Write a protein that binds this ligand. Structure first.
Ligand SMILES: N[C@@H](Cc1c[nH]c2ccccc12)C(=O)O
Length: 353
């Protein structure tokens, strides 16, 4: 079975489980269009991907709280038998989306010569993805790697991206997000490939060797990130650990000209495959953190069952991340899951890194 056919089946089943209706059908078609370029590749025919830590080139993400269900995937453009840092596939997928779906390429085009270079220093140069909510149009996204000119270039490359978008006046937002210089580091730049006012430019940061208190101190700048609640969530999802000792915590911030009190300015991502014995333990932690919301846990259990393909206690690697954002009355959480086309229990930073 090709990678594209196997993941399309899982994605369609997940959409059906979520009752996405016709929106789900269109979403599967978009996934197939974006992964056509993988060709006839089976899993071993593609280079190891950064998308999931086991090297799988797809990640599924499910909103757990939303009244209307909302499904997302991320993937890596890859050429069968070519190293992942080769930029051909990433350069081809933007015009594909622009032409087939009207996706906005104007920010992408302002950046692509710098962020998708011929000879990238890092092993990966892009991810792309899509998100759909029932009854609403699909929204596409691109992620660029801020290490493509070398790890020590991440801030300079980000700043140069703001130069090209005319948004250097937003640098103070980046600067303020860094609390521990050298350990709070930007590593991805994401573009919503839409031309409307809701479209966001987001910077993702790693927080290396961070205590839960330091992660909460980063996030308290943003509306609704009460530090006590952030610390408690991290601790539950870490099984009581207080420090991100190997795999870094991740945050992202939207770069905006003003505060936004819909509480969409920032997100917390807790990595799940290095701080537990196996995915059964992770599932128990999810049941603990979402105890107050049985509808969310029923949705989570159902989606996990459609994506896992072995006993949860065999190792880690099915759960990649859980994300957390404050809401009006309750937190907004999503789970990020791997199809595990390769080996159980990936190492910190993933097999490709
Ligand atoms: N797997 C990569 C990229 C990635 C995929 N999904 C993510 C969600 C959040 C942060 C990063 C990612 C990483 O952990 O860095």
């Amino acid at each position: 079975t090709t990678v594209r056919d196997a993941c399309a089946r899982t994605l369609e089943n997940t959409a059906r489980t979520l009752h996405l209706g016709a929106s789900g059908t269109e979403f599967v078609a978009a996934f197939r269009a974006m992964t056509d370029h993988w060709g006839a590749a089976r899993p071993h025919d593609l280079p190891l991907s950064d998308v999931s830590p086991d090297g799988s080139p797809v990640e599924y993400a499910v909103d757990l709280g939303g009244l209307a269900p909302a499904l997302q995937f991320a993937m890596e453009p890859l050429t069968a038998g070519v190293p992942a840092r080769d930029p051909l596939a990433a350069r081809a997928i933007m015009p594909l989306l622009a032409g087939r779906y009207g996706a906005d390429a104007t920010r992408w085009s302002a950046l692509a010569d710098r962020l998708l270079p011929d000879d990238a220093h890092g092993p990966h140069v892009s991810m792309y993805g899509a998100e759909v909510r029932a009854g609403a149009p699909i929204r596409f996204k691109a992620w660029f790697y801020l290490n493509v000119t070398g790890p020590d270039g991440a801030f300079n490359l980000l700043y140069s991206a703001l130069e090209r978008m005319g948004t250097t006046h937003l640098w103070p937002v980046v600067q303020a997000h860094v609390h521990r210089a050298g350990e709070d580091v930007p590593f991805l730049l994401s573009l919503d490939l839409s031309d409307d006012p809701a479209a966001r430019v987001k910077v993702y940061f790693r927080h290396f060797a961070a205590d839960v208190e330091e992660v909460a101190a980063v996030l308290k700048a943003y509306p609704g990130f009460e530090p006590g609640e952030v610390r408690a969530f991290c601790k539950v999802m870490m099984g009581g650990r207080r420090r991100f000792s190997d795999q870094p915590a991740v945050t992202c911030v939207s770069l905006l000209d003003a505060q936004t009190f819909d509480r969409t300015a920032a997100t917390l991502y807790v990595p799940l495959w290095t701080y537990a014995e196996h995915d059964g333990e992770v599932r128990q932690r999810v049941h603990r953190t979402l105890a107050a919301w049985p509808e969310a846990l029923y949705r989570y259990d159902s989606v996990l069952a459609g994506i896992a393909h072995r006993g949860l206690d065999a190792g880690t690697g099915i759960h990649n991340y859980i994300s957390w954002q404050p809401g009006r009355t309750r937190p907004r959480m999503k789970v990020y899951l791997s199809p595990e086309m390769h080996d159980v229990t990936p190492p910190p930073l993933g097999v490709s890194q």
